[PDB]
Amino acid sequence: RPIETHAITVGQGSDARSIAALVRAPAQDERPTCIWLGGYRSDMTGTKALEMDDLAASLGVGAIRFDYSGHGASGGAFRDGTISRWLEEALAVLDHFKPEKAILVGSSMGGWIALRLIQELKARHDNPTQVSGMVLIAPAPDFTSDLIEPLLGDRERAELAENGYFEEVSEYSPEPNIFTRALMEDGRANRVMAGMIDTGCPVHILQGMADPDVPYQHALKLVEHLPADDVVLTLVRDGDHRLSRPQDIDRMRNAIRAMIE
């Protein structure tokens, strides 16, 4: 089953944007489809995304990747991005292809969006797509309120007021991270850990203890907000935020394979 290229329109009027997607059909329609949900500033050609697709291909199961608005091959401005808009895109991509069974594979911000997506699907009457499992890699639920807000100083707070965004130096590039006022305000609209989260499926979290961006304690906090059954947390002592060494990729591929078989 070959990779196919698609464009999906999301939103209305001046909010409309075209989302680029790469899709591989399952060898038989009854088999699940793995859907990649990436990190803030990622793109769908990244190492972990390509590995998810390769594993899916080898087992004859489906694979969906797409670029968030403002990222990679998709339309829309980065500074117009919010958790609400990026979630809306994820749901639109799923509703375009309508796989019978989905396994959500969410990395960092993509883990937050995965948790919101299951809530949106469970709220619907007509759901052609059942989520059969979720694999979360250094997930970052509620990062705006829980990881950013407590560290903000008066520099950042005034920047947010005067300019509509603040900047922080990025370990991973010469272009610094920017975080908009709109993202911070809307992150509270999408807060998932202020109460208990109902998934209805197995969840496996993979988290490094040498992660300087999402502290491993954040993964322990997420487990306290998940159901009392069918949740596994794998803590890797020397793992960093990217979790993309060969040994890390082996653990992630094995976690996804256990959701299929």
The DSSP symbol for 147 reads I
Q: Does 38 sit near Cl ion (CB under 5 A)?
A: no
Q: 3 or 220, CB closer to Cl ion?
A: 3
Q: Which of 32, 38, 46, 187 binds Cl ion (CB under 5 A)?
A: 46
Contact flag: residue 47 with Cl ion (CB under 5 A): yes
Which CB, 156 or 248, lies closer to Cl ion? Answer: 248
Interface of this chain with Cl ion, residues 226 to 245, rule: CB under 5 A = 244
Residue 208 sits in the site that holds Cl ion (CB under 5 A): no
The answer to whether 45 contacts Cl ion (rule: CB under 5 A) is no
Token digits of residue 109 = 């911000």
242: left (phi over 0), alpha (psi -120 to 50) or beta: alpha
Q: Of the listed pieces 43-51, 109-117, 130-138, 204-212, which binds Cl ion according to CB under 5 A?
A: 43-51
How far the first Cα of the chain sits from its last, in Å, is 20
| Closest to Cl ion by CB, 107 or 180 | 107
Q: Which of 227, 232, 229, 230 is nearest to 197 (CA)?
A: 227
Whether 230 and 239 have beta carbons less than 8 Å apart is answered as no
164: alpha, beta or left? (left if phi > 0; alpha if psi -120 to 50): left
Q: Do 203 and 111 meet the contact criterion of CB atoms below 8 Å apart?
A: no
Candidate residues 24, 48, 71, 116; the one interacting with Cl ion per rule CB under 5 A:
48
Q: What are phi and psi of 46, to 5 degrees?
A: -60, 160
Nearest to Cl ion of 107, 129 (CB atom): 107
Instruction: Return the range that interacts with Cl ion (CB under 5 A); candidates 39-47, 70-78, 84-92, 192-200.
Output: 39-47
Residues that bind Cl ion (CB under 5 A): 46-48, 244
